Amino acid sequence: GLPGMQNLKADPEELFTKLEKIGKGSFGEVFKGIDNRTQKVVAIKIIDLEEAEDEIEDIQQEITVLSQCDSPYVTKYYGSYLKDTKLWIIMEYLGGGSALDLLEPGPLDETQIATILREILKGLDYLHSEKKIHRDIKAANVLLSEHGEVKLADFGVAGQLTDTQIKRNTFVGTPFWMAPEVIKQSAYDSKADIWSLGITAIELARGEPPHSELHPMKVLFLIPKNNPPTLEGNYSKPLKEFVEACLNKEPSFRPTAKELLKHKFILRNAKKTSYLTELIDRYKRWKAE
Ligand SMILES: O=C1Nc2ccc3ncsc3c2/C1=C/c1cnc[nH]1
Numbered sequence: 001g002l003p004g005m006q007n008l009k010a011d012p013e014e015l016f017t018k019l020e021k022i023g024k025g026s027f028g029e030v031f032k033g034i035d036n037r038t039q040k041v042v043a044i045k046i047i048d049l050e051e052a053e054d055e056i057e058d059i060q061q062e063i064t065v066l067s068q069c070d071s072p073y074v075t076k077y078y079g080s081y082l083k084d085t086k087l088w089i090i091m092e093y094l095g096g097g098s099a100l101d102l103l104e105p106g107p108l109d110e111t112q113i114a115t116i117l118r119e120i121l122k123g124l125d126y127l128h129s130e131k132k133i134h135r136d137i138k139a140a141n142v143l144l145s146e147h148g149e150v151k152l153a154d155f156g157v158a159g160q161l162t163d164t165q166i167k168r169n170t171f172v173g174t175p176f177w178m179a180p181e182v183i184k185q186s187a188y189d190s191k192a193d194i195w196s197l198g199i200t201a202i203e204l205a206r207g208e209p210p211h212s213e214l215h216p217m218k219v220l221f222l223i224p225k226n227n228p229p230t231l232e233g234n235y236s237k238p239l240k241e242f243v244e245a246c247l248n249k250e251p252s253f254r255p256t257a258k259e260l261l262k263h264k265f266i267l268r269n270a271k272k273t274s275y276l277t278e279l280i281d282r283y284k285r286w287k288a289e
């Protein structure tokens with residue numbers, strides 16, 4: 001069973017107007033689309049199932065996790081369709097672009113960094129309260145609405161904790177952002193997301209994560225072996241300490257998302273999310289040259 005699977009009689013090529021590519025998930029490309037009945041814009045991920053084995057259980061896990069989330073901070077899932085051998089996965093469209101996109105015109109200021117981190121933390125707090133772990137937190141997977149709302153996306157490797165399985169040990173994520181215990185495949189939980197958040201904070205401040213210049217295979221030993229990264233450069237002490245709190249090699253020494261929502265860097269610098277429209281406008285003006 002696949003949650004939200006629609007009548008196999010329904011034709012997604014009829015119900016949706018498929019537009020340009022806007023991204024990609026674990027296996028499928030993601031397209032902007034129009035719901036032909038409502039004219040709302042949606043995001044459509046298309047996976048070829050014929051061209052796919054081992055992938056399908058990963059796809060089912062993703063959609064299962066997504067369908068169980070109901071949060072302003074997590075991309076909505078609307079349902080799935082089959083067209084011949086292709087699965088059409090219909091999801092919330094966010095027109096502002098990813099936080100990573102919004103870095104292309106130039107650096108963020110610390111108000112913007114704190115606001116985006118605060119909203120990410122609201123998303124993580126929600127997930128972790130549901131015993132879910134995202135496991136691929138990075139600026140590319142943090143999306144903005146055209147109104148500046150901030151949401152977590154791409155649940156391609158998201159995981160579920162249960163009372164019979166308190167921790168996980170699967171090697172998943174994007175290497176530069178992965179926690180040391182995940183890389184070493186030790187038992188881990190939501191604290192792994194908190195490490196990835198720290199890397200993302202560096203990414204938001206500097207434009208790239210630590211080790212970004214190296215072959216990803218090198219971080220397989222570097223991250224477990226080296227002292228954790230710190231934020232280097234002219235940034236406020238609270239931001240540097242926010243980063244340090246997240247990036248501790250010992251997971252139990254990392255704060256919870258709930259706790260980080262009250263961190264002085266967040267409280268002193270975060271502002272209304274509507275202000276992030278300036279960042280979205282900046283990216284639009286820049287794109288247009
Ligand atoms: O709107 C979007 N909704 C999504 C849902 C899942 C997803 N998984 C990978 S991307 C992506 C997107 C997505 C990308 C985007 C890029 N610019 C504007 N929107």
Ligand SMILES: [Cl-]
Pocket residue numbers: 093094095096144145146147
């Ligand atoms: Cl939007």
